[PDB]
């Protein structure tokens, strides 16, 4: 495999579903690739969201960044958007890794919100 050059958005295929408050953010993501949990961040623009709990990974060991917590797979990532006004969005970060050596860049993605009155 000497096209393990891959693009981002195939190694870690980001997805959102959102029904009113429960926004859900997945990754689906390719076997021999992980993404490192200590590099999501997600910050709402015009909203008002819960902190976001990360769940439980696998401890693994690369030299980007010494014994890291990573995902394989998928994750899952469920988002309580408590308020949000129209055009609001959500900025979601993240930076994945491929078991054949090289680390990806952070990448980000700006998901649309849709408006969510408060209570």
Known sequence: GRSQFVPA???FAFDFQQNQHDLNLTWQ????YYLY?????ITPEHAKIAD?????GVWHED???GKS??????LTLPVTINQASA??????????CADAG???????????????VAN
């Open 102 to 116: 090289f680390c990806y860049p952070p990448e980000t993605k700006t998901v649309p919100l849709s408006e969510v």
């Open 52 to 56: 976001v709990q990360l769940p439980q």
């Open 9 to 11: 958005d195939q190694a």
């Open 87 to 96: 055009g609001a969005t959500l900025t979601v970060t993240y930076q994945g």
């Open 29 to 32: 993501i390719k076997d021999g």
């Open 69 to 74: 917590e990573i995902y394989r797979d998928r």
């Open 63 to 65: 030299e980007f960044y």
């Open 37 to 41: 949990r200590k590099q999501i961040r």
